[PDB]
Amino acid sequence: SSGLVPRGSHMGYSATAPVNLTRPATVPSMDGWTDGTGAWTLGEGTRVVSSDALAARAQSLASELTKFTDVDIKAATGSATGKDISLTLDASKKAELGDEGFKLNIGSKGLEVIGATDIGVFYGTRSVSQMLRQGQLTLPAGTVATKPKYKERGATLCACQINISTDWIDRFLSDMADLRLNYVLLEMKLKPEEDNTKKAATWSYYTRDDVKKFVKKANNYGIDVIPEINSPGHMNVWLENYPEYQLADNSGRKDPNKLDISNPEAVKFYKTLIDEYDGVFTTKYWHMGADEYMIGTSFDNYSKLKTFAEKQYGAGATPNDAFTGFINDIDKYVKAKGKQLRIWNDGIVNTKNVSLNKDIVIEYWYGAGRKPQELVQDGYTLMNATQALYWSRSAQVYKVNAARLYNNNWNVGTFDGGRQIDKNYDKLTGAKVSIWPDSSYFQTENEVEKEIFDGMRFISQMTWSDSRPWATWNDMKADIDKIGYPLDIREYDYTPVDAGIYDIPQLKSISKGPWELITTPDGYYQMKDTVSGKCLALFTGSKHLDVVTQVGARPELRNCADVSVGQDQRNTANERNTQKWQIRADKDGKYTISPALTQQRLAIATGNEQNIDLETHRPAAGTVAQFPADLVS
Ligand SMILES: CC1=N[C@@H]2[C@@H](O[C@@H]3O[C@H](CO)[C@H](O)[C@H](O)[C@H]3O)[C@H](O)[C@@H](CO)O[C@@H]2S1
């Protein structure tokens, strides 16, 4: 026989190691590794040692490593040995490491992680976690220092019109942290609570408490959460119940998507929203959008803006000058709150009397506008938000093809439409992927999470390392799958109850039950009524993005859809995904049921829930309906 047996190296440092022992991969890659003699093995007795100041980082890494390796790893202070992982914060290494970089030294003193900042050390621990969670506990000796090429690296997450659950956002932030991504532009509605704005508290919204919680999580992971309230276009979710602030065209027809920037009360309403957000986001930026204001039409249909332009900005001013002056007035407003403004590049229009302020960050997505090289020449600060890095749940033109970009030599300088600029442009901030819902019933959020996996690793590698150390994309793919997700994602209880037969008293207005629960591949349940043989759906009500957003909408029984199929079954998507339910166990043991697509929660209506939608239609008191969790907790 072969006598095949586990090697079982002693823990700690060994001066002997085979010359070609695998060095487990990381993403981003840590390029320019210098080999040393020997190897280091995590094993019984290994500790994570640090200063008192780094204790929280060390305790967290020790609990994480205990879970991935099956070895009891404890945190400690004081002296480290060769058996240990040591964390050091040495702020004097800013030149070598900058604000986010880190050095690993693996040798007879153990595995050292050195950062010049707390986030630097935290980022080095993410590589330590990736290297040790792949089934190999012995790491080749040597040293590497690495730091990101670009300052802003991450994603637009449009949690907009539909709601992306805060559980999903928490996972997403853990994934970003694992990939050293430090930027999320979150276009979302924070629930408006004051007098001139409260009628815009329609769903989706997030409460102040819930935003404070995930911004706190993001900040501990080194992530800047930048809010966007898109304006003066794409304002439907804000202006639906404020027709007094909507722009009317030349025939008097108002569009709930368009802010009337010639109405000072409408401008004040937008500023009031910025003040509301200021209290919960910690970032130094404000993103106002400025995309697609006149989509589907033209300023020729809005003569009122030309009249406004001439009064406000002088004879010969044009609607593009009024539009630009609104952006510059918002810039003035947020600078006075200590923030810097950011817009999408199609907000850059041909002006005459007004010039757009050059202290505004330009997030470039639309290469039909003024071209990337012209903006370089103009001296704007630019972020690459190319359409090549888009996903949409419905627009199949937008699905990121990481293999193609890896193989075609895309880099952060490759702006929309393959238009290359100098990747070393001193005002190129970095690059991001963009996650857009559009018609939202084609894909559940959990399917979005499965689909974006590879593209998130792609953008992490190209904005930190800007290198292709894997010979082809397929070589990269194999390693990013071996690295896998961070612990928080692996521990999330997608489906906390077993499939089988349940009594569900909250659903007695629909059927006396019992109900058969079965799980789906994307972590939800179908609920079949054993009385009618039909399945519970949240199907009917007023919608945004083709998903029911109506507060107080009631679920109904419909013939059972096939919930076992994937997102490529687009022709049955809506019947299928309206029959998916997410079950969560609270703190603790009690269960709440949410429609997978709407992320509101079922509850028995009392008649006391307070929300603008309910001013005009309430579900019959005592029946089961969906409501935002804040109205029912
Ligand atoms: C910027 C870009 N604008 C469109 C983007 O529009 C966004 O649509 C969402 C709903 O999906 C929100 O309404 C935003 O306010 C609006 O900016 C699209 O979603 C995107 C992908 O189809 O394409 C451009 S990029």
Q: For every residue of 124-185, which 3-state class applies, written as one string?
A: HHHHHHHHHCCCCCEEEEEEEEECCCCCEEEEEEECCCCCCCHHHHHHHHHHHHHCCCCEEE
User: Known binder of ligand: residue 123?
Assistant: no
Burial of 35 (0-12, 13-18, 19+ CB in 10 A): exposed
* Residue 20: strand, helix, or coil: coil
Sequence-distant (≥ 6) Cβ neighbours of residue 485 within 8 angstroms: 175, 178
Q: Quote the CA–CA distance of 289 and 413 in Å, as a whole number.
A: 22
Residue with tokens 């991969």: 25
Are residue 32 and residue 141 in the same domain, yes or no?
Answer: yes
Alpha carbon 128 to its chain's center: 24
Are residue 529 and residue 458 in the same domain, yes or no?
Answer: no
Residue with tokens 């008191």: 621
- Bridge-based pairing of strands 246-248 and 254-259 is antiparallel
Q: Quote the CA–CA distance of 92 and 89 in Å, as a whole number.
A: 9
User: Known binder of ligand: residue 377?
Assistant: no
Q: Is residue 5 part of a domain?
A: no
- Domain final position from 491, 518, 537: 491
> The domain spanning residue 190 has which CATH number?
3.20.20.80
Asked if 142 contacts 21 with a C-beta cutoff of 8 angstroms, the reply is no
List all residues whose CB is within 6 A of at least one atom of ligand 1: 158, 160-161, 187, 230, 234, 289, 291-292, 344, 365, 390, 392, 395, 398, 436-438
Q: How far is CA 499 from CA 75, 502, 519, in A?
A: 39, 9, 6
CA 597 to ligand 1 center in whole angstroms: 19
Q: Quote the CA–CA distance of 417 and 475 in Å, as a whole number.
A: 27
Q: Which helix (H) or strand (E) holds 61?
A: helix 55-69
DSSP 8-state secondary structure symbol assigned to residue 92: G
Which residue has the least CA distance to atom 18 on ligand 1?
436
CA quadruple 161, 166, 171, 173: dihedral sign: positive
Asked if 597 contacts 561 with a C-beta cutoff of 8 angstroms, the reply is no
CA quadruple 256, 195, 543, 187: dihedral sign: positive
Total count of domains within the chain: 3
User: Quick one: which of 143, 106, 28 has its CA closest to 469?
Assistant: 28
Residue with tokens 């804040």: 630
Exposure string of 518-541, with b = 16+ CB inside 10 Å and e = fewer, is ebbebbbbbbbbeeeebbbbbbeb
Asked if 595 contacts 555 with a C-beta cutoff of 8 angstroms, the reply is yes
Written as one letter, the residue type at 314 is G
- Beta-bridge partners for 158: 187
Q: What value, to the nearest 5°, has the Cα angle with vertex 548 and ends 546 and 553? A: 155
Are residue 200 and residue 345 in the same domain, yes or no?
Answer: yes
Q: Is residue 621 part of a domain?
A: yes
> The domain spanning residue 549 has which CATH number?
2.80.10.50
Which residue has the least CA distance to atom 2 on ligand 1?
291
Mutate which of 185, 186, 436 for ligand 1? The one with the most ligand atoms within 8 Å of its CB, which is 436
What are the two backbone dihedrals, phi and then psi, of residue 456, each rounded to the nearest 5 degrees?
-65, -40
Burial of 325 (0-12, 13-18, 19+ CB in 10 A): buried
Are residue 507 and residue 486 in the same domain, yes or no?
Answer: no
By residue range, what is the domain housing residue 460? 147-491
Q: Is residue 71 part of a domain?
A: yes
Q: Write out the two tokens for 371.
A: 């071209």
Asked if 302 contacts 249 with a C-beta cutoff of 8 angstroms, the reply is yes
Are residue 341 and residue 312 in the same domain, yes or no?
Answer: yes
CA 184 to ligand 1 center in whole angstroms: 16
Q: Is residue 49 part of a domain?
A: yes
Method by which the coordinates were obtained: X-ray
- Domain final position from 146, 167, 196: 146
Q: Quote the CA–CA distance of 154 and 282 in Å, as a whole number.
A: 17
Where does 393-533 show beta strands of DSSP type E?
414-415, 419-420, 428-436, 500-502, 515-519, 525-529
The long-range contacts involving 4-12, CB below 8 angstroms and separated by at least 24 positions, are 9/39, 9/41, 9/43, 9/138, 10/41, 10/43, 11/41, 11/42, 11/43, 11/44, 11/45, 11/46, 11/83, 12/40, 12/41, 12/43, 12/45, 12/46, 12/81, 12/82, 12/83, 12/110
* Residue 419: strand, helix, or coil: strand
- Bridge-based pairing of strands 340-344 and 361-364 is parallel
Active site members: 292
Q: Quote the CA–CA distance of 242 and 192 in Å, as a whole number.
A: 13
Instruction: Indicate the resolution in Å.
Output: 1.8
Q: Is residue 1 part of a domain?
A: no
CA 28 to ligand 1 center in whole angstroms: 29
- Domain final position from 85, 120, 146: 146
Measured over all CA atoms, what is the biggest interatomic distance in the chain, rounded to whole angstroms? 94
DSSP 8-state secondary structure symbol assigned to residue 13: E
Q: Quote the CA–CA distance of 581 and 523 in Å, as a whole number.
A: 9
Q: Quote the CA–CA distance of 477 and 489 in Å, as a whole number.
A: 19
Are residue 545 and residue 588 in the same domain, yes or no?
Answer: yes
Are residue 339 and residue 484 in the same domain, yes or no?
Answer: yes
Are residue 457 and residue 520 in the same domain, yes or no?
Answer: no
Are residue 86 and residue 171 in the same domain, yes or no?
Answer: no
Asked if 370 contacts 345 with a C-beta cutoff of 8 angstroms, the reply is yes
Of the chain, the end-to-end C-alpha distance in Å amounts to: 64
Exposure string of 277-293, with b = 16+ CB inside 10 Å and e = fewer, is bbebbebebbbbbbbeb
Residue with tokens 């490759």: 414
Q: Is residue 3 part of a domain?
A: no
Burial of 589 (0-12, 13-18, 19+ CB in 10 A): exposed
CA quadruple 615, 616, 622, 625: dihedral sign: negative
Q: Is residue 304 part of a domain?
A: yes
Are residue 352 and residue 308 in the same domain, yes or no?
Answer: yes
Q: Write out the two tokens for 297.
A: 């039409």
Q: Quote the CA–CA distance of 57 and 33 in Å, as a whole number.
A: 24
Are residue 176 and residue 85 in the same domain, yes or no?
Answer: no
Q: How far is CA 402 from CA 127, 388, 428, 474, 568, in A?
A: 22, 9, 22, 10, 19
Q: How far is CA 545 from CA 56, 207, 221, 237, 308, in A?
A: 42, 21, 31, 11, 33
Residues 106/122/179/206 CA torsion (nearest 10 deg): 170
Which residue has the least CA distance to atom 11 on ligand 1?
438
Closest approach atom of ligand 1 to CA 346: 1
Length of the chain: 633
Residue with tokens 């401008």: 267
Q: Quote the CA–CA distance of 271 and 267 in Å, as a whole number.
A: 6
Q: Is residue 4 part of a domain?
A: no
> The domain spanning residue 51 has which CATH number?
3.30.379.10
Q: Phi-psi bin for 72: left (phi > 0), alpha (psi -120 to 50), beta?
A: beta
CB neighbours (10 Å) of residue 367? 17
Are residue 360 and residue 311 in the same domain, yes or no?
Answer: yes
User: Known binder of ligand: residue 161?
Assistant: yes
Q: How far is CA 626 from CA 92, 148, 200, 538, 555, in A?
A: 55, 45, 18, 8, 8
Mutate which of 234, 236, 399, 443 for ligand 1? The one with the most ligand atoms within 8 Å of its CB, which is 234
Written as one letter, the residue type at 487 is L
**Peptide linkage before 204 cis (omega within 30 of 0):** yes
Sequence-distant (≥ 6) Cβ neighbours of residue 45 within 8 angstroms: 11, 12, 83
Could you tell me the strand order of the sheet in which 74-76 lies? Answer: 12-14, 34-41, 138-146, 102-107, 110-115, 85-89, 47-50, 74-76
Q: Which helix (H) or strand (E) holds 211?
A: helix 208-220
